[PDB]
């Protein structure tokens, strides 16, 4: 009788996954003119 044993290595298996997300943000409004240069009263003529 021997009963003699052996020894191995520590083998482990795992599944890893990292995830993320996305969101789009928008801000708009109906045009009521716009930032202009030389905002002055005018007198058009044809």
């Amino acid at each position: 009788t021997r009963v003699h044993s052996y020894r191995g290595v520590l083998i482990i298996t795992d599944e890893l996954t990292v995830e993320a997300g996305s969101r789009v943000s928008l801000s708009g409004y109906v045009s009521d003119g716009g930032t202009s240069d030389v905002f002055t009263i005018c007198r058009l003529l044809d």
Partner: protein, 55 residues
């Protein structure tokens, strides 16, 4: 001559009259309201020329 309020929210040029202004006014006189607006490029411009009576 007093500055007005450029109101973004209500989209109006407004001014409230106080008790101090009325110390230089007389009840009945028909004054003229002239409104000037100055843009970024420094251009004074008359917008309104209404007449007001404080009765």
């Amino acid at each position: 001559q007093s500055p007005m309020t450029v109101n973004k929210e209500s989209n109006r040029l407004e001014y409230i009259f106080s008790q101090n202004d009325y110390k230089v006014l007389v009840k009945g006189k028909v004054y003229d309201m002239i409104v000037n607006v100055v843009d970024e490029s420094g251009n004074h411009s008359t917008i309104l020329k209404q007449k007001v009576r404080f009765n």
